[PDB]
Ligand binder design. Structure first.
Ligand SMILES: CCCCCCCCCCCCCCCCCC(=O)OC[C@H](COP(=O)(O)OCCN)OC(=O)CCCCCCCCCCCCCCCCC
Ligand SMILES: CCCCCCCCCCCCCCCCCC(=O)OC[C@H](COP(=O)(O)OCCN)OC(=O)CCCCCCCCCCCCCCCCC
Ligand SMILES: CCCCCCCCCCCCCCCCCC(=O)OC[C@H](COP(=O)(O)OCCN)OC(=O)CCCCCCCCCCCCCCCCC
Ligand SMILES: CCCCCCCCCCCCCCCCCC(=O)OC[C@H](COP(=O)(O)OCCN)OC(=O)CCCCCCCCCCCCCCCCC
Ligand SMILES: CCCCCCCCCCCCCCCCCC(=O)OC[C@H](COP(=O)(O)OCCN)OC(=O)CCCCCCCCCCCCCCCCC
Ligand SMILES: CCCCCCCCCCCCCCCCCC(=O)OC[C@H](COP(=O)(O)OCCN)OC(=O)CCCCCCCCCCCCCCCCC
Ligand SMILES: CCCCCCCCCCCC(=O)OC[C@H](COP(=O)(O)OCC[N+](C)(C)C)OC(=O)CCCCCCCCCCC
Ligand SMILES: CCCCCCCCCCCC(=O)OC[C@H](COP(=O)(O)OCC[N+](C)(C)C)OC(=O)CCCCCCCCCCC
Ligand SMILES: CCCCCCCCCCCC(=O)OC[C@H](COP(=O)(O)OCC[N+](C)(C)C)OC(=O)CCCCCCCCCCC
Ligand SMILES: CCCCCCCCCCCC(=O)OC[C@H](COP(=O)(O)OCC[N+](C)(C)C)OC(=O)CCCCCCCCCCC
Ligand SMILES: CCCCCCCCCCCC(=O)OC[C@H](COP(=O)(O)OCC[N+](C)(C)C)OC(=O)CCCCCCCCCCC
Ligand SMILES: CCCCCCCCCCCC(=O)OC[C@H](COP(=O)(O)OCC[N+](C)(C)C)OC(=O)CCCCCCCCCCC
Lengths: 80, 506, 60, 75, 491, 64, 205
């Protein structure tokens, strides 16, 4: 069911919904890293997992700021 | 030098008052920083010492002669770009003040230069993910530096989403390699190069192919380059390719150890499509930056053929091609920024709107450049004929060396296709030359008192006032003659490329 | 002479999964942050380590 | 080496002369610019000659090992 | 003492013209004296430059040995080796001779920018001349395609109404095809590590690889001679390019394909050239026959001359691919003779009639001998020279090329004799119309051929007659060089 | 003026106009459009390489 | 005595007589036909859901229309690809190997079969011209050696000792024909007679 690109329907029809999809996709990689590190008893993989969480948080902030300013520009006359 | 000086500039810029003059002088400070960085790097890093390859910072980074050459190229090209914002490009306040409006312009560039230089040096999958995001985030900020521009913010929104998906693919590939092997250091992974899924590295390359606008992911790159300001498009369309292509060559160098034929075919398939879209795509377009975006896609495809072959001749071909293409890229965008002073002023059909961010936006805005400035027009013609591949310009030798690597490794189909694509792309390349000069003899006896340059006041009616500032005109003059007169020193330059080794030794 | 020179440089030596360059100069595990002596599965003796493979510098 | 640096200085005069045409000034405008331009590329030419002379030494040393590798292949 | 002096002098010549004309361009609103009389003093300097270029090769000609086998005047310049043999020496002289002739043709018939035109013409003459004295494939290709950039701008700026279409045709036809020749050159540098003329002539490649290399090289050559069916660009370019551009294109550029066969095919791909010879003859014979019949239906005056060059160069391709000395010498003789007669026909059509009436349609002209007797004398004489009438160099070239073709292939090579009839059919039908009947009702009486146009016609006619009556001036130089190209094992 | 123009400047111009018109409609700013193409490229990794020519024929079919 | 014609063909690895186990044309073609139909059919239904997810947003509709296929295309594409897979395998078995002639025939016929389905509202000659064009492209693809020559490249030949690294020697004459990428100083005269034949200057005048 994945090869027919079923996930393209589960994503909503708003720009912020695309942002949510990216966070979920990146979160799946981090969960996989924790899964492998825990089985191996490897703290190096848990270091990688922590880095992925911190880096993904930075990505969300930058993307939101661009989207905030993009919404600001349209409602920017502010004559009142 | 970069990191320490960046912190000082960050604090200093926020302390002094907000003004165009201080921002321009701060931009010159950034120019000195990059120049000092180049001097320090050249003092300690040499080609001979780095031939073996030296690990750094607990083997997280690995520098060799191949990596060092690109870093030196990155610093040099960044110096030429800062000259645009550190000096006048047209001499007119209404046009030039855009570069001096944003104080964080030089700060964001210094952030990206750190990412660009460290990316080819990555030796761990963890630091690979960290650095690729460091470079990607800096590009998003630079694309959105003009936050009062609707197109600039829209492009950055597009850039963020496409790059984030590519970063996820890159992260997904590295995580899958860790699951199979449990190791994060690349050199440790090379011990198991014959026991890991080699198509996981193809997933890694797919993320890198997105970040360089390769087909089928070309569409976002063309849209972003056309909408972004010319001063921003000049950076974001060249700098990411300097570092990512170098990293792709290293990854392909490791992949060729197992020599997976299926891996080569998939990359060949993407190169074949990129040559089709790169050539036929630019045939029917009216924007100059849209035309250059297709030109960028086509030339990256030519370099990828050298990268895919990954042999001794590929090192010579790639190093030469990336250096000469960057110089041609700088020269063309430098001329485009300057020639905005020859635009006629209305004093209407098609209701054409031109903004201050992209004064030159259409190919036909280059009309009568042969009459307006014969030396600048010839400089553009030399650059365009280099992209075509007319010998003995720098462009011909780049394609000549790429063909050598492609045909030596047996890529007969791609070599023939790249030459058909070159002929097809010559059509839109020649269109630029047609606009510049083909109406010279009919418009020689014409009067133009409505040009932008005509609005510039004179000093005393006796001073010989040049139309162009000293710095930008000198850079165009230097780059044009290097492209034209490469035959004089071609033999020695290739000998320098002979000594760039990626673990060849003997 | 020029043809001979280009033949030497342009020749790419064959690489395979049995012969290739790995840039590791030492064996890890001589010191761990804590609990260095684990299940005694580390059989590599650093007191009698044989000489490592050294990288070749063609210019030296 | 003087002839080499003379050529590099000649190239620097060409760059300045080509700059004058770009800026639309007579070629005698500020003649001191040619002195600055020529000495700038003389400095680049001096460094370029050192780069090429150094590269020739490095190439010869590597060629010796390549010939040894070729002899083993041809046997 | 040749390439070094030729390049340095011409580069200094280019700089000299640029400094003088572009000194006062700084929005001076000036008048200046160099621009007086349509920039006479700038055209004169460029004309002097072309004359001096001829003297440069003459100094090396004095030391040329016709009894010495191998390249002479071997010189290293720009990391490239340059040399001269019998075949190269004559082709260089022809290229440099047409320099002043091309400049003098557009002396006072350009709308402006004479300095740009003069520099472009001299640049093209030197670049084409250097292409005959390079000693490797890479250097051959560099000069083979370097002429495209000056020629593309020259046609697009000084061209006729359809100059835009002509500029696209010459740029794309001659580049897309030459790139296939570059592939064969790249293959040589991969498997032999060198593209030197002498080095690659002694190497025998596999019969399959020689077939692939021959096809790649012949595509670039066949488009440039040109041969059917890749010839359609040439009539468009000639009908729209300026007269000086037509002279260089018809007199020099089309001869590079014949010289390309000498250097790139015969001595290095000798085994596959024998196999390809029947195919080359079939293509060239059809090129000769079809072009002559197509010329009978053309209405543009300059297009008719353009198609005539295609038929003659088909004979040159036939002669040069014959495996005997008679065919090879005749092909080289015909190239030299065509290098003078063909520009003269363009001068008569595109330089004399066009500069007065500005219309190239054939329906406007008839009975021109009534008020232009001097024009008709040269038109008739050059028409007979173009048709291969004896006492002209074209007859010597055509007869030996036909004879060499019959020696190479008695059955199908006999068809080359049809050039004697077919060439007279279209050339005389044009000349008979232009001189016969009453003077045209659509033309006003005006000046006959002026002194400047008399000079151009006379000094293009003189070499043709000298070669035609005493071709031993040319044969003696060529005999030793041409004998090396023959491949045969008689036992 | 016939077949050599069909296999020449006139024929290639019509071919170029048809192909370039299709490519002009593929370049527009749309998150859903570029997202599907990126996800579609993942099928190249999944598919066995012997199917590349079938993909190549399929791509040409969509140009029509 | 056949005519002596040039052979501009790149080297290909040959299988001796008795080798080349044939390919099951039906099974290989059925996998492509079924696989293509499920994906094209599956994506069509998925795109219908995207239309129903929202139909008042012009941006989404514009991109969905580009990827949308007509009913004839959803049927024609799997049939054309399935026919291509069958004919390519069937023609390869006849010739004991894959050739550009067989791929030209397989591509042109399969394209014409497909074109007759989803391009019904066009002249037949128009579909023949495209089928010839499509078949020629894949014939050129096979002639060039697919995406890479593989072990028939010069780099592979140079590693195996079949190159020109050792130079050339006129004093050594090899009766057997040299390699594709190998060059020699002097060749046997018998080989020249094989390539060209007696006649216009070989042996006899
Ligand atoms: C500013 C130009 C400074 C040139 C410095 C070139 C350089 O970085 O060194 C050459 C470098 C290899 O250097 P390396 O082998 O490590 O050490 C030996 C050095 N003698 O090799 C390299 O990697 C350099 C590759 C880039 C080459 C750039 C060539 C110059 C670009 C044009 C400069 C235009 C100057 C414009 C002036 C503007 C101000 C008016
Ligand atoms: C002797 C000198 C020879 C020099 C030239 C040699 C090459 C000659 C090429 C001949 C083929 C092109 C000439 C004929 C094409 C004419 C195109 C045309 O007529 O219309 C375009 C056609 C659709 O037809 P339509 O738009 O309706 O026009 C009305 C027709 N009654 O649109 C179509 O249906 C075309 C098919 C769809 C597009 C297919 C594209 C696939 C790739 C084609 C090959 C490109 C290869 C490029 C390689 C480098 C880039 C990878
Ligand atoms: C007086 C000082 C001038 C420079 C002296 C010098 O050493 O430059 C080298 C060369 C002089 O010649 P030489 O050193 O004896 O060695 C032959 C290399 N040409 O002098 C030169 O090489 C200068 C050559 C400048 C002209 C080259 C421009 C190329 C023209 C376009 C290419 C056309 C052919 C392809
Ligand atoms: C404006 C005019 C321009 C020119 C117009 C066309 C004329 C030129 C072409 C016509 C041919 C010219 C003469 C060629 C024939 C001369 C050779 C000959 O003598 O004929 C007989 C000869 C066979 O000799 P034989 O000794 O019997 O062979 C024994 C083999 N054991 O060899 C033969 O068997 C004869 C070969 C077959 C005949 C070929 C002639 C037909 C050519 C058609 C061209 C297209 C029309
Ligand atoms: C659309 C139609 C265009 C023409 C059809 C393709 C023609 C190609 C051809 O020359 O015939 C080949 C094909 C049979 O395929 P073939 O490889 O020859 O099988 C071996 C038989 N000894 O013959 C056919 O199947 C037809
Ligand atoms: C089943 C999933 C979808 C198929 C995969 C698509 C993605 C991979 C293809 C790579 C190129 C990406 C192009 C962008 C994706 C295409 C999206 C699409 O399908 O849009 C269809 C587009 C518009 O078609 P249109 O008819 O105008 O609109 C239909 C309205 N009823 O029609 C088009 O114009 C799209 C075609 C773009 C041109 C690509 C050409 C690639 C090169 C093919 C020839 C190869 C060149 C070498 C040939 C010789 C090889 C030996
Ligand atoms: C209006 C203007 C129109 C154009 C006019 C052109 C006039 C040319 C001027 C004469 C020049 C001259 O004489 O150059 C000669 C000198 C000295 O050569 P050398 O030191 O022996 O080097 C060896 C030369 N070999 C190999 C031929 C023997 O080389 C130079 O300086 C070269 C100038 C730089 C060319 C650009 C390529 C190198 C870039 C390096 C960084 C990437
Ligand atoms: C040792 C190596 C360096 C060379 C020494 C000189 C350095 C420059 C300082 C001098 C002062 C100056 O540059 O003054 C500025 C001048 C003049 O500009 P203008 O437009 O006439 O100004 C107008 C002033 N009026 C009104 C009086 C006329 O600019 C130049 O001449 C530009 C050339 C820069 C120098 C050459 C650099 C070459 C680098 C290329 C190698 C990669
Ligand atoms: C053999 C090596 C030669 C290389 C260098 C040649 C000179 C380059 C131009 C610099 C000077 C300049 O741009 O000056 C312009 C000159 C002079 O023309 P003008 O009528 O006075 O100019 C108009 C000004 N008016 C109207 C006030 C009088 O015209 C040229 O452009 C001629 C030379 C270029 C011809 C070919 C262009 C494309 C080159 C592509 C290379 C692959
Ligand atoms: C192997 C030998 C190769 C020889 C050369 C190949 C054909 C060259 C055609 C000249 C085109 C030209 O001139 O481009 C200019 C022409 C302009 O057309 P126009 O004349 O104004 O009429 C047409 C315009 N209308 C209808 C308005 C009147 O635009 C084209 O056609 C654009 C497509 C050209 C692509 C060429 C790529 C060739 C690929 C390599 C070979 C497979
Ligand atoms: C102006 C446009 C020019 C276009 C180009 C024209 C080229 C003409 C070449 C024709 C060659 C020919 O007819 O060759 C003849 C051969 C037949 O030889 P065979 O049966 O193998 O042996 C013959 C032995 N007998 C006599 C004992 C039976 O036919 C072919 O195999 C054609 C293959 C290529 C077709 C294309
Ligand atoms: C010109 C080349 C002519 C080759 C004829 C050929 O290759 O013939 C046509 C081939 C059939 O050859 P086949 O069946 O694969 O092999 C033949 C039989 N064998 C196995 C016994 C040898 O098919 C084709 O139409 C392939 C498409 C031709 C594309 C040519 C592109 C050339 C580009 C320029 C390269 C420098």
């Amino acid at each position: 069911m994945d090869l027919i690109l079923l996930m393209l329907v589960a994503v909503g029809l708003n720009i912020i919904d695309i942002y949510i999809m990216i966070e979920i996709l990146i979160m799946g990689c981090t969960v996989n890293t924790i899964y492998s590190a825990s089985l191996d008893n490897d703290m190096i993989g848990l270091i990688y997992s922590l880095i992925q969480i911190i880096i993904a948080g930075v990505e969300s902030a930058i993307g939101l700021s661009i989207l905030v300013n993009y919404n600001r520009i349209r409602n920017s006359e502010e004559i009142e | 030098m970069l990191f320490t000086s960046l912190l000082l500039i960050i604090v200093y810029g926020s302390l002094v008052n907000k003004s165009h003059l201080l921002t321009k002088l701060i931009n010159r400070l950034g120019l000195i920083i990059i120049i000092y960085t180049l001097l320090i790097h050249l003092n300690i890093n040499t080609l001979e010492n780095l031939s073996i390859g030296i690990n750094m910072f607990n083997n997280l980074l690995l520098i060799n002669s191949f990596n060092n050459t690109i870093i030196e190229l990155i610093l040099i090209i960044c110096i030429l770009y800062v000259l645009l914002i550190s000096f006048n490009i047209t001499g007119l306040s209404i046009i030039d003040n855009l570069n001096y409006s944003k104080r964080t312009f030089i700060v964001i560039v210094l952030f990206n230069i750190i990412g660009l230089t460290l990316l080819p040096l990555v030796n761990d999958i963890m630091i690979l993910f960290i650095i690729i995001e460091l470079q990607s985030y800096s590009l998003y900020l630079l694309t959105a530096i003009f936050n009062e521009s609707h197109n600039s913010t829209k492009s950055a929104l597009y850039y963020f989403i496409v790059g984030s998906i590519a970063s996820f693919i890159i992260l997904d590939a590295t995580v899958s390699i860790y699951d199979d092997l449990g190791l994060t250091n690349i050199q440790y992974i090379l011990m198991y190069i014959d026991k890991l899924e080699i198509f996981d590295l193809l997933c890694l390359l797919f993320g890198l192919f997105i970040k360089i606008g390769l087909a089928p992911f070309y569409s976002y790159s063309i849209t972003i380059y056309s909408l972004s300001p010319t001063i921003i498009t000049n950076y974001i369309s060249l700098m990411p390719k300097l570092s990512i292509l170098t990293l792709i060559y290293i990854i392909m160098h490791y992949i060729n150890i197992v020599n997976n034929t299926d891996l080569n075919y998939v990359i060949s398939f993407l190169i074949l499509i990129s040559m089709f879209i790169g050539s036929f795509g630019g045939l029917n377009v009216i924007r100059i930056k849209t035309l250059l975006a297709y030109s960028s896609l086509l030339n990256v495809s030519y370099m990828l053929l050298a990268i895919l072959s990954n042999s001794n001749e590929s090192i010579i071909a790639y190093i030469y091609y990336i250096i000469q293409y960057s110089l041609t890229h700088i020269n063309i965008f430098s001329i485009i920024l300057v020639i905005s002073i020859y635009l006629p002023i209305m004093n209407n059909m098609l209701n054409v709107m031109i903004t201050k961010y992209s004064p030159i936006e259409y190919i036909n805005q280059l009309k009568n450049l042969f009459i307006n400035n014969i030396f600048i027009a010839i400089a553009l013609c030399i650059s365009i004929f280099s992209l075509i591949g007319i010998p003995p310009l720098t462009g011909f030798y780049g394609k000549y060396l790429v063909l050598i690597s492609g045909l030596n490794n047996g890529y007969v189909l791609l070599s023939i296709v790249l030459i058909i694509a070159s002929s097809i792309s010559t059509v839109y390349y020649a269109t630029i030359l047609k606009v510049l000069s083909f109406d010279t003899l009919s418009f020689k006896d014409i009067i133009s008192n409505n040009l932008i340059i005509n609005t510039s006041p004179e000093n005393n009616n006796n001073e010989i006032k040049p139309e162009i500032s000293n710095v930008i005109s000198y850079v165009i003059s230097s780059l044009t003659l290097i492209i034209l007169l490469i035959i004089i020193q071609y033999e020695n330059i290739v000998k320098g490329a002979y000594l760039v080794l990626l673990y060849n030794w003997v | 002479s020029t043809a001979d020179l280009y033949g030497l440089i342009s020749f790419t030596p064959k690489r395979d999964i049995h012969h290739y360059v790995i840039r590791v100069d030492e064996v890890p595990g001589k010191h761990f942050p804590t609990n260095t002596t684990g299940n005694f599965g580390n059989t590599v003796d650093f007191e009698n380590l044989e000489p490592r493979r050294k990288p070749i510098n063609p210019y030296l | 080496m003087i002839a080499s640096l003379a050529g590099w200085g000649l190239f620097g005069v060409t760059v300045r002369a080509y700059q004058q045409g770009i800026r639309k000034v007579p070629f005698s405008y500020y003649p001191l610019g040619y002195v600055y331009s020529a000495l700038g590329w003389v400095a680049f030419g001096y460094g370029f000659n050192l780069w090429t002379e150094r590269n020739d030494k490095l190439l010869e040393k590597r060629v010796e090992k390549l010939k040894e590798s070729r002899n083993l292949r041809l046997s | 003492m040749l390439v070094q002096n030729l390049i340095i002098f011409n580069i200094i010549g280019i700089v000299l013209l640029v400094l003088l004309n572009n000194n006062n361009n700084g929005i001076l609103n000036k008048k200046s004296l160099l621009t007086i009389k349509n920039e006479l003093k700038l055209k004169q300097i460029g004309l002097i430059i072309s004359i001096i270029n001829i003297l440069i090769i003459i100094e090396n000609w004095i030391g040329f040995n016709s009894n010495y086998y191998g390249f002479q005047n071997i010189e290293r310049f720009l990391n490239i080796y340059w040399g001269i043999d019998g075949i190269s020496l004559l082709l260089v002289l022809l290229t440099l001779i047409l320099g002043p002739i091309a400049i003098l043709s557009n002396w006072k018939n350009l709308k402006g920018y004479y300095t740009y035109y003069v520099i472009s013409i001299n640049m093209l003459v030197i670049l084409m001349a250097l292409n005959f004295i390079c000693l490797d494939l890479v250097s051959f290709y560099i000069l083979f395609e370097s002429t495209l950039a000056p020629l593309f701008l020259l046609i697009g700026i000084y061209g006729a109404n359809n100059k835009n279409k002509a500029a696209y045709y010459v740029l794309i036809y001659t580049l897309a095809s030459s790139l296939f020749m570059l592939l064969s050159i790249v293959i040589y540098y991969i498997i032999i590590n060198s593209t030197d003329y002498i080095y690659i002539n002694n190497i025998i490649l596999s019969i399959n690889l020689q077939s692939l290399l021959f096809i790649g090289i012949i595509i670039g050559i066949a488009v440039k001679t040109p041969l059917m069916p890749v010839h359609t660009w040439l009539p468009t370019v000639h009908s729209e390019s300026p007269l000086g551009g037509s002279i260089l294109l018809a007199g020099v550029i089309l001869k590079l394909a014949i010289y390309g066969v000498i250097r790139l095919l015969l001595p290095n791909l000798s085994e596959i050239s024998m196999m390809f010879t029947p195919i080359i003859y079939i293509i060239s014979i059809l090129t000769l026959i079809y072009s002559s019949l197509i010329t009978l239906k053309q209405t543009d005056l300059k297009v008719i001359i353009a198609y005539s060059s295609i038929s003659h160069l088909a004979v040159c391709m036939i002669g040069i691919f014959a495996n005997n000395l008679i065919g090879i010498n005749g092909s080289l003789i015909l190239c030299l003779a065509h290098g003078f007669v063909s520009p003269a026909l363009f001068i008569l059509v595109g330089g004399i009639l066009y500069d007065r009436y500005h219309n190239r349609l054939i329906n406007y002209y008839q009975g021109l001998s009534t008020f232009m007797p001097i024009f008709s004398i040269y038109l008739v004489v050059f028409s007979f020279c173009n048709t291969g009438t004896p006492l002209s160099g074209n007859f010597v070239g055509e007869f030996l090329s036909i004879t060499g073709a019959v020696i190479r292939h008695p059955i199908i090579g006999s068809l080359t004799a049809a050039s004697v009839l077919l060439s007279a059919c279209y050339q005389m039908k044009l000349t008979n119309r232009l001189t016969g009947s009453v003077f045209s009702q659509y033309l006003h009486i005006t000046n006959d051929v002026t002194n400047r146009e008399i000079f151009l016609l006379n000094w293009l006619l003189i070499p043709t007659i000298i070669i035609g009556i005493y071709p031993s001036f040319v044969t003696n130089i060529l005999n030793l060089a041409s004998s090396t190209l023959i491949y045969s094992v008689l036992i | 003026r016939g077949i050599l123009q069909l296999f020449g400047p006139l024929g290639l111009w019509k071919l170029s106009t048809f192909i370039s018109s299709k490519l002009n409609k593929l370049v527009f700013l749309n998150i859903g459009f570029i997202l599907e193409i990126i996800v579609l490229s993942w099928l190249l990794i999944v598919f066995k390489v012997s199917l590349l020519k079938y993909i190549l024929l399929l791509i040409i079919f969509i140009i029509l | 005595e056949q005519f002596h014609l040039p052979q501009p063909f790149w080297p290909t690895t040959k299988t001796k007589e008795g080798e080349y186990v044939p390919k099951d044309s039906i099974r290989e073609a059925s996998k492509v036909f079924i696989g293509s139909g499920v994906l094209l059919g599956g994506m069509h239904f998925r795109r219908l859901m995207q239309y129903k997810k929202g139909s008042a947003r012009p941006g989404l509709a514009k991109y969905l229309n580009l990827f949308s296929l007509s009913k004839s295309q959803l049927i024609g594409f799997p049939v054309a690809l399935g026919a291509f897979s069958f004919l390519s395998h069937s023609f390869a078995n006849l010739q004991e190997g894959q050739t550009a002639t067989g791929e030209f025939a397989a591509s042109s016929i399969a394209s014409l079969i497909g074109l007759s389905i989803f391009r019904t509202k066009k002249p037949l000659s128009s579909n023949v011209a495209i089928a010839v064009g499509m078949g020629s492209l894949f014939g050129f693809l096979t002639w060039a050696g697919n995406f890479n020559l593989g072990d028939n490249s010069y780099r592979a030949a140079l590693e195996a000792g079949n190159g020109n690294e050792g130079g050339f020697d006129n004093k050594v004459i090899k009766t057997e024909r040299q390699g594709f990428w190998e060059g020699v100083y002097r060749r046997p005269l018998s080989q020249t007679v094989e390539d060209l034949g007696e006649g216009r200057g070989i042996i006899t005048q």
